[PDB]
Amino acid sequence: PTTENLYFQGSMNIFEMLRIDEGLRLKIYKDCEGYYTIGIGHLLTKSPDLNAAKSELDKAIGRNCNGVITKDEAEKLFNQDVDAAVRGILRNAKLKPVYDSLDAVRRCAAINHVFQMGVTGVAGFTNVLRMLQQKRWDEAAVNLAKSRWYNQCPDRAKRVITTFRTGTWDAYKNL
Numbered sequence: 631p632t633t634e635n636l637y638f639q640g641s642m643n644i645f646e647m648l649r650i651d652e653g654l655r656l657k658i659y660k661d662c663e664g665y666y667t668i669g670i671g672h673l674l675t676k677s678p679d680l681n682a683a684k685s686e687l688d689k690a691i692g693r694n695c696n697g698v699i700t701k702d703e704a705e706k707l708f709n710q711d712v713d714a715a716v717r718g719i720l721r722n723a724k725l726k727p728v729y730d731s732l733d734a735v736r737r738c739a740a741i742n743h744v745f746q747m748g749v750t751g752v753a754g755f756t757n758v759l760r761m762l763q764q765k766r767w768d769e770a771a772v773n774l775a776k777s778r779w780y781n782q783c784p785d786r787a788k789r790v791i792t793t794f795r796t797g798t799w800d801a802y803k804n805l
């Protein structure tokens with residue numbers, strides 16, 4: 631690896647990781663599962679009612695948005711959502727010990743996974759949790775690739791799975 635390649639891990643963190651997986655959109659859109667989304671992966675609601683999504687947006691941002699936000703507002707919401715996912719892991723009796731056992735890069739993959747799926751969803755991968763704690767990375771990655779989370783929307787999940795496999799940032803290189 632070049633001097634520049636060795637610097638690349640210092641440029642990657644949970645914010646950059648999720649920014650790649652979720653993208654950045656300033657207008658309400660439907661995600662791969664058809665849920666109204668905005669910003670960097672902010673799920674507004676699971677209701678099919680666009681009006682509900684706009685109401686949630688205005689609540690979340692604190693002004694009359696009519697379905698559009700600024701980059702700065704997207705980033706604020708993004709930071710709040712990342713903090714929520716981290717807090718969700720750390721207060722959970724099942725996730726915390728697994729997360730604690732992980733290296734820094736795999737901890738990012740964990741926060742990412744919880745950001746995407748929510749705490750109970752993630753805690754439901756009983757076997758994968760045990761595999762991660764036991765450093766059975768290949769098996770963990772194979773089992774993650776069976777999940778509806780990955781299979782329903784592979785492009786959003788694939789990088790995270792690879793990261794659980796390797797504990798490196800390689801999946802986020804050369805976009």
Ligand SMILES: Cc1cc(C(F)(F)F)n[nH]1
Nearest residue numbers: 725728729740743755758
């Ligand atoms: C499958 C899984 C476990 C985890 C965590 F949060 F580290 F426990 N995140 N994703």
